[PDB]
């Protein structure tokens, strides 16, 4: 009779990425009109993270669903709309992400 202990199933975080120069150290996948990264979800997902890049230093993990970037919601966004938002984000990139337990 081992009772299941309390466990987090889903998280929504606000992560602030800091890049003085160069990149955010992440790749994104998916978007409206593209093949899904996870099952049927058409949302923008983080497909990889550089270990020596800023995103890893901010807590960004692989599989995080990208919901918002510095005040722009990416719900139902085409892939190139997320792309443009991220490239055009300045030195501080605060994003809202949806995370799921593995």
């Amino acid at each position: 009779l081992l009772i299941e202990p309390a466990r987090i199933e889903e998280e929504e975080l606000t992560l602030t990425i800091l890049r003085q120069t160069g990149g955010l150290g992440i790749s994104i996948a998916g978007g409206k009109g593209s093949t899904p990264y996870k099952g049927d979800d058409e949302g923008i997902f983080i497909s990889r993270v550089s270990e020596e890049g800023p995103a890893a230093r901010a807590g960004v993990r692989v599989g995080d669903k990208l919901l918002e970037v510095n005040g722009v919601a990416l719900q139902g966004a085409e892939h190139h709309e997320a792309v443009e938002a991220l490239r055009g984000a300045g030195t501080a990139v605060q994003m809202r992400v949806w995370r799921e337990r593995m």
């Binding site: 990149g23 955010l24 992440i26 790749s27 996948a29 998916g30 497909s47 792309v83």
Partner: peptide
Amino acid sequence: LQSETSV
């Protein structure tokens, strides 16, 4: 159509 983009 599958896009992946590093930024």
